Structures are given as C-alpha cells and as structure tokens.
Amino acid sequence: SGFRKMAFPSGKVEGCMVQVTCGTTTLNGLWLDDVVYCPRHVICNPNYEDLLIRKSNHNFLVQAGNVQLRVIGHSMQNCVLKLKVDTANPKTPKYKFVRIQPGQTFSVLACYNGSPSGVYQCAMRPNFTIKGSFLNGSCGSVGFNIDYDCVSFCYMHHMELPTGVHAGTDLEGNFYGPFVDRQTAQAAGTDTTITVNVLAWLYAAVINGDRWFLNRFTTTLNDFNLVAMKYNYEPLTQDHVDILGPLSAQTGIAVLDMCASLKELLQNGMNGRTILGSALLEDEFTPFDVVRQCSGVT
Amino acid sequence: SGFRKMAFPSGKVEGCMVQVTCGTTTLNGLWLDDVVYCPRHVICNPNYEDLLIRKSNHNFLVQAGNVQLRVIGHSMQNCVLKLKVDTANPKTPKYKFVRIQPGQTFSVLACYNGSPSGVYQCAMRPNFTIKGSFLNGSCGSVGFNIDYDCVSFCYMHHMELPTGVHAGTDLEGNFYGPFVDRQTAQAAGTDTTITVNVLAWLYAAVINGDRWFLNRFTTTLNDFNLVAMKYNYEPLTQDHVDILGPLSAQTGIAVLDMCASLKELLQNGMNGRTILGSALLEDEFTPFDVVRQCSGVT
Ligand SMILES: N#Cc1ccccc1C[C@@H](N)C(=O)N[C@H](Cc1ccc(Cl)cc1Cl)C(=O)N[C@H](CC(=O)NCCCCN1CCCC1)Cc1ccc(F)cc1
Ligand SMILES: N#Cc1ccccc1C[C@@H](N)C(=O)N[C@H](Cc1ccc(Cl)cc1Cl)C(=O)N[C@H](CC(=O)NCCCCN1CCCC1)Cc1ccc(F)cc1
C-alpha cells in the first residue's frame, strides 16, 4: 500500500556525472563512453559557431571525481557541446537518448560541480517547461527513465526562466518548447493540466483502497472535454482512453465513468477531503507510473 | 528556484542490495563488508531462538545479482538476522548505523528480489510508522541519509500494518515504536503533525519567493502551543525554535512571527491558495532538508 512520487534508482547515472569548466564558467556534463555532453553555453546574445571556432581542446577542463580527463576533440550538436576525451567511462550503463512528449515523467539527478546532490520526479509540462528544483550550478543536470537496466536520457537542464520554472534540451541538444540558449527573459506559453495523468492518479487511489470520489454517473467523451476546457485541462483523446484501458480493467471502473468522477471533482472541489494525501488533483503521474508502483490487484 | 521532495542519490546503497531466501520465503538483505543484514522473519507467533537453532548455514540462499554468496555463519541481533558470507562486498560505501528520532526524514530504496525499483523520501511519524509505498516482497528494503559520501542507514522495512502504513527497525534490529515481528494485527498510536517541519516548510516557501501567508502578528510560545493542541500538532519546544534559527535569520522572520502565520493558517485554512504547490500544510521536510535544498540567499 501507499503511493509516493517515486524516482528511478540513480546509481547508473551518478557514475556518468562530471564537471566541465571553460574560463570561469563551470557546469555539469554527462560522460558516456569517450564523450562528455554538456550545455554549449559553457563556452560563453552569442554567436556560438563564432565562439567555438576560437576554442582549443585545452580550453576545456573536464573533471571526473578528482581525476582530470583530457579533451581530444570537440563539436557542437544543436545546443549541446560534445567533448571527446581520451578515456572511455568504465561505468557507462546501457543507454539510449530519447525525446519525450509533454505529459511524460522522468527522474532528475540534480548535480553541482559534477557531484550528485539529490533525485526527484518531474513531468514535462504541456508548455514544455518543468517545475524543477534547481540552484545556480545545476545546469547540465540530466533527466532520465530506466527500463531493465537501460537508461533512457531525455532531458538536460539549461536554464531557469524568470518565472522560476525550468527549460532544457534532449540529449541531442534540441530544446523542448520554443526556447533558445541566451540570457534573455523568455516566457513559456500558458500551461494546462495533464488530464490523462489526473485520471491515472484517480485509478491509483482506487487501487490503494479509496473510493469516496466515485459516482454512479458516466459521461460522453465530448461532454467531458467541454468541462475540461472550462477548467484549463488538456482535451482527453481516444488514445488517452485506450492507454488507461489496463487500469480500467483492473479496477472495474470504465474510463468514462472515472471521467464523470473527475467532472464532479472539478465542479465541486473535494469538500475538505484528500486523495492519496493531496488536497488538489495531481497530474504528474502517468498511467505507466501508476502501473509501475501500485499493486497489480486492487 | 523550486521545491520538491528530494531523495539522496541511491547508487551507494544500490550496490549493497541482495536477495535472501530461506525455504519459500524471499526478501531483501543489505550486504556490507562480509555480512548480510535482513529481517529475521525470513526464517519463518514464532519463537525465533528455537527456529534459528534448527537452521544450518546452507539453509540460507543469498544472491547478489546472478552470483550466489556462500553463508559461513549466522546470528540474530534483536529483530535482524546477520549472515556472514565468504566474500566482502567490493562496493561497500563508508557507512554508519543510526537510530533516528521521530520527525526526521530519510530516503527509502524500495527493492524487490534484491533489485532496486525506486527511491522516495519518508519521515518517521510521531507514532513511529512511516507512510511508505511498499508491495509484497519489499521487506528488507532500507532507509538512509547521506553526508559527504557516508551512508547513515536508519531503517529496515519489516511489515505493513492493517492500516497500510509501515513499520520497521533500525539496522541493529530494534523496532521503531511498540511493534513486534509477528503476523498479528498491530495498531499504531494516534499520529500528530510535525510542527517544526511545517514551520521549516513555510520558511522554504518564503525563500522561494512566496509571502502571502505572513502577517504582522507575533505569538508567545505558550499561546501557540494551545492552538497546536487544538489541531493535533506536536508541541513546539524551545529546542525546535533554536533549530529554526538559521532559517529565521536568512529570511528576517522571527520564529514566533512564523508561528503566528501558522496559527492563522490553521484557524482559517488557505482560502483556495497553495503553498509550494500544496493545498495542505506539509510536515515531511525537516529544517535540515530545507537548508539542503533551498537557496542560501532569499
Ligand atoms: N536552474 C537554475 C538556476 C537558478 C538560479 C540561478 C542560476 C541557475 C542556473 C543557471 N545556469 C541559470 O539558469 N542561469 C539563468 C541565466 C541563463 C544562463 C544561461 C542561459 Cl543559456 C540562459 C539563461 Cl536565462 C538565470 O540566472 N536565470 C534567472 C534565475 C532567477 O533569477 N530566478 C528567479 C525567479 C524567481 C521566481 N519568482 C518567485 C515568486 C514569483 C516568481 C532568471 C532569469 C533572469 C533574467 C533573464 F534574462 C533570464 C532568466
Ligand atoms: N510492505 C508491504 C506489503 C504489502 C502488502 C503485502 C505484503 C507486504 C510485505 C510483507 N513482507 C508484509 O508486510 N506482510 C505483512 C504480514 C507480516 C509478515 C511478517 C511479519 Cl514479521 C509481520 C507481518 Cl504483519 C502483511 O501482509 N500485512 C498486511 C498488508 C495488507 O493487507 N495491507 C492492506 C491495507 C489496506 C489499507 N486500507 C486501504 C484503505 C483503508 C485501509 C496487513 C496485515 C494484515 C493482517 C495482519 F495480521 C497483519 C498485517
């Protein structure tokens, strides 16, 4: 029993974190085989191609623990700098680089000076920011998921926006969202609530033994989405209904039946009650996160 | 900016998790140097001394990854079984065993069949349970804190109570709370809210840039505790006031000034507002957790 925000065990990523210094700029890098990946703004409205052509391999100081790694080559891929080093990381896990969709979750290993400090779960918001916890020196920290000892890296942290939320790239250096890597005040689009995740979390609550929010009503998909629009929820698609199939089958509660519960919760509030220890509707658990953590029997 | 429930990086503990099997009972163990620690109920109203004297070293099957470890000795310390193995764990971190006080927090590495599955933060509740997330097979999972690469183990998981909360021991096998390791329905005492942690979390909110809940009033310690009793909060001691000193100094808000805010929040609710993304008052962040994660400048 129970339900917590749960991160993946971080050890496979801890062994890859290094420190990258250029001039007086120091941030984190990711050491996989004989390449270190880090935000290209370590070399700093900039012209990065002009700035990088003025660089030499010996301008980059890469430190793994108390060992200095020698840079033997460098290149830029979109917004990530790639530093070839003379030593392959002996702790490289099996890994992939993946670009995720909004609404998906991942674990963040927050790092400072190449040293891991903590791990927590994030969701990619519909507006392509994350609501992280990051201080100065955290840039280059990565987000990841793990499946059968393969690490799928999906996020590298690049900047905190003026609103205090966070923006970054995939590990091939492409930003999520419309952002660019320059120190200008940039604004994200208006955010929305991840409806399919809220529904997954309601199923988690039922699996854990809580039913107070259920009702005898059902709704059509179209009528539910009219309420969704009113409360700044993302539209629920038939694909979302399909992905909730397994949780619906396990609990015996049809998806559109759970939508009628969510509709009632949106229109009336919780009236002083909690769900899985929360007084608001939680949207940073995917259906996959629920299946991963909750019992396979209700 | 930001504030998340943040676990310690788990890699140093991941390298210590093993599987212990006796008969048809399998749970997790902790492999440090040449000793494996696990809940003694793996050998199962039992008489453990009588049950253990009937055991042989070869009755214990210890598996680290896909490698079997040979047990060369066994003993019982309170409610933990200690299995001497023929191989010292080459990944043993620097470590200590510590017994924590209620109100303190720790990271839990949830494990199944000796394989880590996820990491999350817990607090030891005033009634000596934890509100964990655990399924069948999780017993033997451990809780820990990390300071400068030393792992302080403080919890080993032994059982889920009928209410769905969790009970366990320190790593020397002494239960937290009044519980015993037998499969009987046991009840915890009534729980209370960890007042000093709620205050720490309000300071976290101020550091992060949120002030809406402050007021111009102060309170005496005695008058605050009269309100605390009314709302099932733990009494605030002068020691608690002292430990909040650093956060009070950083924010410029006297502790008894923040108590007046908490009093107003308890008596009036939040009136539709949130604090650090929560619609209820959070009590599983210690003052230390706040200093660790939040900026050192407001
Ligand atoms: N992570 C992180 C991090 C955090 C702090 C310092 C440094 C870092 C890492 C650090 N690497 C980092 O991100 N630095 C960026 C500056 C930067 C550097 C390289 C690039 Cl390529 C792009 C950017 Cl942009 C940074 O300094 N952002 C600040 C951070 C800030 O003040 N938050 C206050 C919000 C308060 C929110 N308020 C609270 C209540 C209401 C709102 C907001 C900002 C201001 C002006 C701008 F022009 C652009 C951005
Ligand atoms: N972790 C864990 C875990 C979880 C499940 C299975 C197995 C394990 C690990 C597993 N190792 C474990 O703990 N097993 C214990 C049984 C046990 C074994 C060795 C010892 Cl020495 C002591 C105990 Cl006691 C266990 O089966 N507890 C159940 C678990 C249970 O049904 N929760 C339902 C609560 C629903 C809560 N409701 C929801 C809404 C309202 C309340 C509650 C219980 C029932 C009767 C008793 F006599 C004592 C305890």
Domain CATH for B181:
2.40.10.10
Query: For residues A282 and A201, what is the distance between their CA atoms, to the nearest angstrom?
Result: 7
Distances (CA, A) of A240 to A38, A286, A288: 35, 11, 12
Residue owning tokens 């079984």: B81
In this structure, the answer to whether residues B253 and B144 fall within a common structural domain is no
The contacts of residue B24 (CB under 8 Å, 6+ apart) are: none
Residue A101 per-residue DSSP state: P
Are A1 and A125 in the same domain?
A: yes
- One domain for residues A21 and A154: no
**Which amino acid does the sequence have at B224?**
F
Number of C-beta neighbours around residue B114 at 10 A: 21
What is the rounded CA–CA span in Å between residue A23 and residue A5?
A: 39
Please check whether residue B2 touches A, CB under 8 A.
yes
Residues with CB under 6 A from ligand 2: A 1, 209; B 41, 134-136, 138-139, 158-164, 166, 181-185
By what method was this entry solved?
X-ray
Give the pair of three-digit tokens for residue B88: 């010292």
- A158 and A168 in contact (C-beta within 8 Å)? yes
Q: Is the dihedral of CA A177, A181, A187, A191 positive or negative?
A: positive
A192 HSE (CA, 13 A, CB side): 16
Between residues 27 and 56 of chain A, which touch chain B (CB distance below 8 Å)? none
A159-165 long-range contacts (CB < 8 A, ≥24 apart) are A159/A183, A160/A134, A160/B1, A161/A129, A161/A185, A161/A186, A161/A187, A161/A188, A162/A186, A162/A187, A163/A187, A163/A188, A164/B1, A164/B2, A164/B208, A164/B209, A165/A125, A165/A129, A165/A130, A165/A131, A165/A132, A165/B1, A165/B2
Q: Which two tokens stand for residue B157?
A: 């998981």
Token code pair at residue A248? 């619906």
Place of tokens 């680089």: A97
Interface contact A268, partner B, CB < 8 A: no
Examine the fold and report which residue of A191, A220, A252 is the final residue of a domain before the chain moves on: A191
Q: Which residues of A202-240 are buried (b: 16+ CB within 10 A; e: fewer)?
A: bbbbbbbebeebbeeeebebeebbebbeeeebbebeeeb
> Which residues does chain B break after (C to N > 2.5 Å)?
44
Q: Is A120 helix (H, G, I), strand (E, B) or coil?
A: strand
**Same domain flag for A111 and A175:** yes
User: Minimal CA–CA distance to B152: which of B196, B111, B104?
Assistant: B104
Alpha helices, H only, A80-236: 195-207, 221-230
Q: How far is B60 from chain A (nearest CA, A)?
A: 27
Choosing from B41, B157, B158, B240, which is the catalytic residue?
B41
- The gap between the terminal CA atoms of chain B, to the nearest Å, is 10
Instruction: Give Cα separations from A157 to A121, A131, A135, A249 (angstroms).
Output: 14, 12, 11, 38
Specify the DSSP class assigned to residue B204. H
Do B206 and B238 share a domain, yes or no?
Answer: yes
Task: Calculate how close chain B gets to A52, using CA atoms only, in Å.
Answer: 30
Q: What is the DSSP string of B249-277?
A: HHHT--HHHHHHHHHHHHHH--TT--BTT
User: Which of A247, A5, A264 is closest to A122 using CA atoms?
Assistant: A5
Is residue A296 helix, strand or coil?
coil
Q: In which domain, by residue range, is A277 found?
A: 192-295
A2 touches chain B (CB under 8 A): yes
What number of helices (H) and strands (E) belong to chain B?
8, 13
CB atoms within 10 A of CB A128: 17
Q: Which two tokens stand for residue B272?
A: 């539709």
Q: Answer whether B90 contacts ligand 1 (Cβ < 6 A).
A: no
Do B143 and B218 share a domain, yes or no? no
Residues A109 and A88 grouped into a single domain: no
| B261 shares its domain with B276 | yes
- Give the strand pairing for A94-97 and B150-160: unpaired
Residue labelled with tokens 């670009």: A99
**What are the tokens at B163?**
């209410």
Is the same domain home to B2 and B116?
yes
The rounded distance, in Å, linking the Cα atoms of A133 and B214 is 23
| B199 vs B262: CA distance, rounded Å | 7
Read off the DSSP letter of residue A35. Answer: E
CA of A268 to the centre of ligand 1 (A): 38
Asked if residues B28 and B114 have their Cβ atoms less than 8 Å apart, the reply is yes
Task: Please check whether residue B14 is in contact with residue B116, taking contact to mean a CB–CB distance below 8 angstroms.
Answer: yes
Comparing C-alpha atoms, which of A169, A197, A46, A42 is closest to residue A114?
A: A42
Q: How far is the CA of A85 from the centre of ligand 1 (A)?
A: 30
What is the helix (H) or strand (E) element at residue A265, kind and residue range? helix A255-268
State which of B73, B93, B113 marks the end of a domain. B93
CATH number, domain of A245, equals 1.10.1840.10
Task: Give A133 Cα–ligand 1 centroid separation in angstroms.
Answer: 12
Q: Is the CB of A136 under 6 A from ligand 1?
A: yes
For residues A213 and A279, give the distance between their C-alpha atoms in angstroms, rounded to a whole number: 13
Residue A35 CA to its chain's centroid (Å): 23
Amino acid at A26: T
Distance CA A12, CA A144 (A): 10
Distance from chain centroid for Cα A227: 27
CB B91 within 8 A of CB B33: no
Ligand 1 contacts CB of residue A111 (under 6 A): no
Q: Which of A6, A117, A118 sits opposite B118 (nearest CB)?
A: A6
**What span, in angstroms and rounded, lies between the C-alpha atoms of A152 and A149?**
10
Q: Do A59 and A179 fall within a single domain?
A: no
| Out of A14, A119, A132, closest to residue B7 by CB | A119
Tracing tokens 């790639």 back to the chain, one arrives at: A82
A160: which strand partners? A166
Q: Which of A8, A109, A117 is nearest residue B118 as measured by Cβ atoms?
A: A8
d(CA A255, CA A276): 19
Q: Which ligand is nearest to the CA of A45?
A: 1
- Measure the CA–CA gap between A267 and A279, rounded to whole angstroms: 15
CA distance B123 to A251: 30
Q: Kindly give, in sequence order, each residue whose CB lies less than 8 Å from that of residue B15, ignoring residues fewer than 6 positions away.
A: A11, B89, B91, B92, B93
Resolution stated for this PDB structure, in Å: 1.7
| Burial bucket for residue A259 (CB in 10 Å: 0-12, 13-18, 19+) | buried
In this structure, are residues B251 and B195 in contact, taking their beta carbons and an 8 Å threshold?
A: no
Residue finishing a domain among B93, B117, B151: B93
Q: Are strands A71-77 and A80-85 parallel, antiparallel or unpaired?
A: antiparallel
> For chain B, what is the domain count?
3
Q: Do B120 and A295 touch (CB under 8 A)?
A: no
Q: Are B189 and B171 in contact (CB under 8 A)?
A: no
Instruction: Give the ligand at the shortest distance from the Cα of A211.
Output: 2
Instruction: Give the ligand with the smallest distance to the CA of A44.
Output: 1
Which residue among A7, A116, A278 sits closest to B119, beta carbon to beta carbon? A7
Number of other CB atoms surrounding residue A256 within 10 Å:
17
Q: What does DSSP say about strands A150-160 and A94-97: parallel, antiparallel, or unpaired?
A: parallel
Q: How many CB atoms lie within 10 A of CB B252?
A: 9
Residue pair B135/B155 in contact (Cβ under 8 Å)? The answer is no
Q: Looking up tokens 């987000």, which residue turns up?
A: A143
**By the 8 A CB rule, do B266 and B231 touch?**
yes
For residues B6 and B140, membership in a common domain is answered with yes
Residue that the structure tokens 């009036």 belong to? B268
Indicate whether A129 and A104 sit together in one domain: yes
Are B10 and A9 within 8 A, CB to CB?
A: yes
B279 vs B272: CA distance, rounded Å: 8
Q: Is the CB of B279 inside 8 Å of chain A's CB atoms?
A: yes
Q: How far apart are CA A148 and CA B104, in angstroms?
A: 33
